[PDB]
Amino acid sequence: MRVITLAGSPRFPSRSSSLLEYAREKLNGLDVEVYHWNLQNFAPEDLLYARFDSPALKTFTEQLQQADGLIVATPVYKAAYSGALKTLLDLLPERALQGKVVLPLATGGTVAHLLAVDAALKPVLSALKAQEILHGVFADDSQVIDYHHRPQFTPNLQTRLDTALETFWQALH
Amino acid sequence: MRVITLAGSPRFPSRSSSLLEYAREKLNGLDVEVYHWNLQNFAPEDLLYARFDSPALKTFTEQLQQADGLIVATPVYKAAYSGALKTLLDLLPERALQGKVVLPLATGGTVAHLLAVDAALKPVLSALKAQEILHGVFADDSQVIDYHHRPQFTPNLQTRLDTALETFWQALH
Numbered sequence: 001m002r003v004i005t006l007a008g009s010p011r012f013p014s015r016s017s018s019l020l021e022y023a024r025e026k027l028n029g030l031d032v033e034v035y036h037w038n039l040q041n042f043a044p045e046d047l048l049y050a051r052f053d054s055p056a057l058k059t060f061t062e063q064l065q066q067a068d069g070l071i072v073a074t075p076v077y078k079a080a081y082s083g084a085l086k087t088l089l090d091l092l093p094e095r096a097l098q099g100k101v102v103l104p105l106a107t108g109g110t111v112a113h114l115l116a117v118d119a120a121l122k123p124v125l126s127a128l129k130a131q132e133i134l135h136g137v138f139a140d141d142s143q144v145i146d147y148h149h150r151p152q153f154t155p156n157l158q159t160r161l162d163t164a165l166e167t168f169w170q171a172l173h
Numbered sequence: 174m175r176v177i178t179l180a181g182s183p184r185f186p187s188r189s190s191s192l193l194e195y196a197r198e199k200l201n202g203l204d205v206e207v208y209h210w211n212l213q214n215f216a217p218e219d220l221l222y223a224r225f226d227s228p229a230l231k232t233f234t235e236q237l238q239q240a241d242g243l244i245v246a247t248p249v250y251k252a253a254y255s256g257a258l259k260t261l262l263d264l265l266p267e268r269a270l271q272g273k274v275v276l277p278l279a280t281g282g283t284v285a286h287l288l289a290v291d292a293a294l295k296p297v298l299s300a301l302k303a304q305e306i307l308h309g310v311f312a313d314d315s316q317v318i319d320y321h322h323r324p325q326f327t328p329n330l331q332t333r334l335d336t337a338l339e340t341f342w343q344a345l346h
């Protein structure tokens with residue numbers, strides 16, 4: 001079983017990335033092969049100028065091809081996903097998520113814009129042909145107590161993450 | 174009267190940018206001060222890693238502050254605007270478009286996704302507090318005859334552009 005995790009925040013460390021950190025740990029407890037990527041792992045000029053011959057993109061697309069699922073996280077920037085994350089999604093082959101389960105995760109300042117980022121991400125993931133897009137976990141900033149050390153969440157957010165991850169695990173089989 | 178034009182495509186030249194090229198020409202005929210920017214005018218590492226101390230961002234935000242209107246163009250990538258364009262929008266101050274008229278332009282492969290990019294751009298421009306977001310011009314690729322030489326459009330697309338630009342000009346007063 002193989003899963004890719006992808007951090008869409010251009011900050012290091014990152015609040016949305018702390019949800020991914022918790023996921024990877026849950027998953028490694030389950031004997032899942034996890035490959036974690038963030039935007040530092042690509043040359044910025046390749047991403048900004050959509051250079052499809054990017055070496056790192058080749059590796060990333062090869063790892064994603066073998067993967068059964070993708071967990072992708074983003075901050076809410078200007079009522080949507082980060083542009084930095086979108087630069088990489090734009091460079092993925094057509095059908096890149098065909099046959100795969102996608103769990104979206106996000107953190108944001110306001111609940112209204114957490115609804116907005118959910119609505120904005122879905123058509124993009126559908127354009128990549130994701131087999132199923134799970135409901136996901138969209139949490140306001142106050143729900144993350146610590147994203148600099150060991151991730152710490154409110155009980156509500158930890159429960160929502162655990163549910164989503166169990167749903168993700170089952171959807172993979 | 175001052176207008177910023179902003180090309181969101183990471184390609185040079187670009188089909189969506191040819192609509193901007195036509196706009197800038199119409200506008201310079203009207204005695205409008207036009208400042209044109211594209212993603213080559215920023216350091217890619219500043220955009221991908223959301224570096225708010227970017228020197229070019231400072232200049233761009235200063236020119237935009239003095240501007241009365243913005244014409245922004247994007248390709249349709251994965252049923253939305255380009256991530257490359259979003260990386261720059263993400264770096265604009267809150268309220269960056271307060272008091273300003275915005276004309277969105279886009280080119281894409283399919284009509285269905287031209288509706289999608291219209292719906293995706295609006296909340297982002299609203300998050301930047303644009304005073305009015307014009308209907309805009311969203312054209313499929315077959316409507317651009319030439320974007321490498323002097324821009325050439327089908328009569329239908331040229332008419333739609335001329336209408337939109339007249340609407341933009343009036344909205345500015």
Ligand SMILES: Cc1cc2nc3c(=O)[nH]c(=O)nc-3n(C[C@H](O)[C@H](O)[C@H](O)COP(=O)(O)O)c2cc1C
Nearest residue numbers: 009014015016075076077078079107108109110113
């Ligand atoms: C440039 C920038 C733009 C933001 N725009 C929004 C917004 O439009 N709506 C909102 O609710 N939160 C907004 N936020 C708050 C972030 O979504 C929130 O703090 C998020 O948890 C940051 O996640 P990260 O640490 O993983 O980058 C913005 C933050 C930044 C830095």
Ligand SMILES: Cc1cc2nc3c(=O)[nH]c(=O)nc-3n(C[C@H](O)[C@H](O)[C@H](O)COP(=O)(O)O)c2cc1C
Nearest residue numbers: 011077078108109110113141225263264265266267
């Ligand atoms: C609703 C909301 C919207 C925000 N929008 C922005 C924005 O558009 N640009 C920005 O620089 N910060 C924005 N912020 C603030 C960032 O969260 C704040 O600057 C934080 O200290 C950034 O830290 P970071 O870069 O580590 O994420 C927003 C915050 C909230 C709650």
Ligand SMILES: Cc1cc2nc3c(=O)[nH]c(=O)nc-3n(C[C@H](O)[C@H](O)[C@H](O)COP(=O)(O)O)c2cc1C
Nearest residue numbers: 182187188189248249250251252280281282283286
């Ligand atoms: C990476 C990439 C992704 C694209 N994704 C879409 C899409 O999801 N839906 C669509 O209708 N057209 C899609 N297209 C076609 C472009 O929107 C269209 O060719 C556009 O005119 C290119 O504009 P530009 O020359 O200004 O970059 C895509 C093109 C590229 C290069």
Ligand SMILES: Cc1cc2nc3c(=O)[nH]c(=O)nc-3n(C[C@H](O)[C@H](O)[C@H](O)COP(=O)(O)O)c2cc1C
Nearest residue numbers: 052090091092093094184250251281282283286314
């Ligand atoms: C609906 C539609 C969707 C497309 N989606 C993609 C895509 O996701 N990735 C890509 O590389 N090309 C995509 N293309 C194709 C590009 O338009 C094509 O590769 C073109 O030759 C790219 O030229 P350009 O990079 O100069 O824009 C799409 C085309 C259409 C009509």
